[PDB]
């Protein structure tokens, strides 16, 4: 979620906000600070974890050639989830 700085400046998804003594805040006066309000980390955190029944699962991001390079994810660790290193989708074996 997009929060606010103690000065009232809006904090971006990279965690950027000028401190209270930074003169560079004058650039936003009589203007606005451009912040994208769709934090991708919080959005990918909302996706469920797929209960696929295999030790190795494949993920290409969905949409075939319109996704990402196809990768194979190991699902042998029973404490962690196997997540795709391209799009963040998570996978796990059924109910351990």
């Amino acid at each position: 979620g997009v929060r606010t700085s103690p000065t009232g400046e809006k904090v971006t998804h990279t965690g950027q906000a000028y401190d209270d003594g930074d003169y560079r805040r004058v650039r936003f006066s009589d203007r606005q600070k451009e912040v994208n309000e769709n934090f991708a980390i919080d959005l990918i955190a909302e996706q469920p974890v797929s209960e696929v029944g295999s030790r190795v699962i494949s993920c290409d991001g969905g949409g075939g050639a319109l996704g990402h390079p196809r990768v194979y994810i190991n699902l042998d660790k029973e404490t962690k989830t196997g997540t795709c290193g391209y799009c963040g989708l998570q996978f796990r074996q059924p109910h351990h």
């Binding site: 971006t12 990279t14 965690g15 950027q16 560079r24 650039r27 936003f28 009589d30 203007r31 606005q32 600070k33 451009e34 769709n38 959005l43």
Partner: protein, 48 residues
């Protein structure tokens, strides 16, 4: 779009905005990275 509507996404703007140049809604650039070097803060306690 009446016959072939676009695919619905939850992150797509539901309200299109025109060119806001010359308005207080105009985009102003800034560095999106955090500070690289952290300075040493002196102790608040004096040595004497």
């Amino acid at each position: 779009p009446t016959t072939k509507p676009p695919t619905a996404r939850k992150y797509i703007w539901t309200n299109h905005k025109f060119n806001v140049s010359g308005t207080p809604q105009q985009y102003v650039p800034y560095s999106t990275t955090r500070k690289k070097i952290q300075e040493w803060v002196p102790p608040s306690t004096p040595y004497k």
